[PDB]
RNA sequence: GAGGA
């Protein structure tokens with residue numbers, strides 16, 4: 001659901017990069033290759049963690065109660 | 066006046082709920098195996 | 111065989127009634143106890159036999 | 167407030183004795199939720 | 213079943229069903245070793261009983277009644293099923309009596325007229341039969357439920373229905389010709405609520421729907437307008 | 447130390463199937479028995495043997 | 496005119512409440528789009 | 529101190545730091561809940577301990593949870 | 608129904 005913290009293997013914190021990642025995509029139109037590299041996710045153990053996340057918690061947030 | 070709706074109602078329901086395509090009196094002679102329980106284990110499933 | 115199997119024994123006249131343990135009574139609800147299938151069959155045999163005695 | 171049940175549909179509050187089992191009095195619903203406890207449940211961070 | 217060792221007259225024992233034993237929770241001795249788990253037409257005078265059963269069942273179908281009401285009526289019929297105090301009574305009067313028995317016992321509101329529309333009982337022999345049957349069952353051993361049925365039959369919302377509920381609740385304490393066959397009181401409370409509202413269900417439709425008097429409603433409404441004082445919740 | 451052989455290495459999609467073991471582990475040490483045959487009951491959920 | 500029986504309805508069949516509803520409603524119905 | 533060394537009944541200020549968290553969806557839009565919303569309660573005794581690390585340039589740390597409107601989250605933690 | 612293997 002929500003971003004995981006701490007790339008599973010690598011351990012690096014990634015739970016904060018999510019917002020900025022989305023921002024780069026929308027406002028900067030950036031390409032997610034370069035987007036990731038901008039956030040510093042060098043090794044793919046973390047790049048995977050971000051790039052492939054799926055943010056279901058959005059669709060959870062739409063049930064009224 | 067005096068039409069047994071319960072006939073159709075219950076007949077349809079029972080048949081669906083068990084899947085014995087036949088009659089509620091038909092236990093085994095009724096064809097079965099239709100109407101399973103919608104495996105919802107994983108969206109793709 | 112003479113002692114154990116004489117052909118007339120191949121047709122029943124008296125009938126043995128297996129005791130409850132062969133046909134135990136499941137109490138699958140707690141006020142009433144669904145009787146064993148055989149017991150129904152026995153009730154049926156007994157009913158019919160009663161009826162035949164009556165009709166005779 | 168302290169709570170005893172929640173209407174499922176109206177998502178408000180409610181209280182009931184062994185009386186009725188239904189009727190979110192406003193919506194008159196028929197399904198109620200059991201109004202999460204207050205035991206300050208403990209959790210293990212792992 | 214007692215502990216030979218501990219020997220307390222009310223034996224504090226436990227059943228360790230998972231082990232299938234029974235233990236003297238005091239001394240620990242096991243008492244019983246293997247615990248059997250169990251968890252998973254004319255020759256019988258039930259000929260008339262089953263005829264009643266079948267007619268009762270088809271009637272229950274027609275009424276769309278709950279299986280609990282069906283069972284209650286079947287049980288009531290089985291409870292009487294024969295008596296001099298019954299003495300015949302057409303075997304349909306008793307059906308209708310036991311049906312109303314089942315509905316009342318399972319808290320289902322049913323009109324004698326609805327039951328008679330189900331079954332030709334002439335309604336007077338039905339009255340006598342239900343009286344005698346009630347008395348028999350009393351030997352053998354709460355009018356609010358009617359409101360929402362008619363609210364539905366007229367297509368009325370739930371806040372309207374609860375307004376009617378509170379009105380009928382005050383009806384008992386508002387003698388000043390409160391009830392005297394309070395079906396009229398229920399219907400006039402409904403009329404009060406609709407007139408409080410702006411619903412085009414004017415008396416004609418409600419009367420022809422519920423088979424009620426077009427005049428007893430206004431007869432009640434006469435005292436109802438005076439009674440209006442004790443009916444404003446919000 | 448380095449390994450003498452290099453390693454194939456990369457991400458790959460893996461799906462966790464059901465039936466964790468905690469639903470298979472099962473052990474009976476004289477528990478309850480049936481009615482008909484007085485043999486041990488069946489099914490681990492029912493403490494079977 | 497005359498009542499008879501009662502038919503089960505396939506979900507989102509033309510006769511189902513959901514058959515045409517939109518997303519936001521679906522959410523309000525607590526029913527996953 | 530390691531908790532298994534502090535004799536206090538499971539925690540104290542020599543072996544633990546108590547954090548706490550309250551969030552409420554006051555807004556109409558989604559209310560994010562960031563690590564930075566954590567607040568120390570226990571006394572640090574002047575030990576540079578327990579401020580959630582904020583490498584984020586925007587200043588709010590890890591994204592803990594999201595809140596819609598009425599959803600309220602309120603808990604306390606022990607470090 | 609389920610069903611793993």
Ligand SMILES: [Zn+2]
Pocket residue numbers: 007008009010011012043044045046047
């Ligand atoms: Zn990593």
Ligand SMILES: [Zn+2]
Pocket residue numbers: 173174175176177178189190191192193194195
């Ligand atoms: Zn409600």
Ligand SMILES: [Zn+2]
Pocket residue numbers: 215216217218219236237238239240241
């Ligand atoms: Zn003992």
Ligand SMILES: [Zn+2]
Pocket residue numbers: 534535536538539540541542543544
């Ligand atoms: Zn301590």
